[PDB]
Design a protein around this ligand. Structure first.
Ligand code: IHP
Ligand code: CL
Ligand code: ZN
Length: 187
DNA sequence: TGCGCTTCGCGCT
């Protein structure tokens, strides 16, 4: 239903250029009889609530806003669900977001979480520990490659028929942040 | 609000 502006996607999912926002596109699919049952309306996207010191507001990271709308997704406790995020920035630890997703994964064992990050948010000094905490809690933690960039444009963007157009250095930036993530999940 | 540059903003307007 709600689709992203092409420009917003291209300026925020670029894996070589950062933004002071985080977008998170999500898919919820249900596992049926050893197969995937793709939930058609359980697809969406959100961004973080921007910090607003002028209003006294500390901000709320994209990941925590996803945990906020879980109730509204009406996941059946009986069914088993795979949640996939495509997130412009890897989840933080320092602000408690990794703690929360972990706590939520321990609580909801019928949820399997997959995270694809465009870019690694090493502006948080404990970013390693975020990614490690999330892996430890069962979550698949990956870097977004061409296939996930393309999937997200095809599924979340108001493309009006335009094929995804890879930006310069997509594959190089993706290999580089793949190397960094592999080394941080080795330990 | 919109700008300019851009690591879940900041510092102008
Ligand atoms: O997820 P998207 O990038 O939007 O594109 C999908 C994807 O791509 P491929 O054709 O490149 O594999 C599908 O494969 P998966 O999502 O299962 O990985 C494919 O289904 P098939 O692999 O069976 O071809 C589907 O086509 P459709 O949705 O009609 O089944 C196709 O769309 P495009 O290939 O046209 O981008
Ligand atoms: Cl986060
Ligand atoms: Zn966070």
């Amino acid at each position: 239903r709600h689709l992203m502006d092409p420009h917003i996607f291209t300026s925020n999912f670029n894996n070589g250029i950062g933004r002071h926002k985080t977008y998170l596109c999500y898919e919820v699919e249900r596992l049926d009889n050893g197969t995937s049952v793709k939930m058609d309306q359980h697809r969406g996207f959100l961004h973080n609530q921007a910090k607003n010191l002028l209003c006294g507001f500390y901000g709320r990271h994209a990941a925590l806003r996803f945990l906020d709308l879980v109730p509204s997704l009406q996941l059946d406790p009986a069914q088993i669900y795979r949640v996939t995020w495509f997130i412009s920035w890897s989840p933080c630890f320092s602000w408690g977001c990794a703690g929360e997703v972990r706590a939520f994964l321990q609580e909801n064992t019928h949820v399997r979480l997959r995270i694809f990050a465009a870019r690694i948010y090493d502006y948080d000094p404990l970013y390693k520990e975020a990614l490690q905490m999330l892996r430890d809690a069962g979550a698949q933690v990956s870097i977004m490659t061409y296939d996930e960039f393309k999937h997200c444009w095809d599924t979340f963007v108001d493309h009006q028929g335009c094929p995804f157009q890879p930006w310069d250095g997509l594959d190089e930036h993706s290999q580089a942040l793949s190397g960094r993530l592999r080394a941080i999940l080795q330990n």
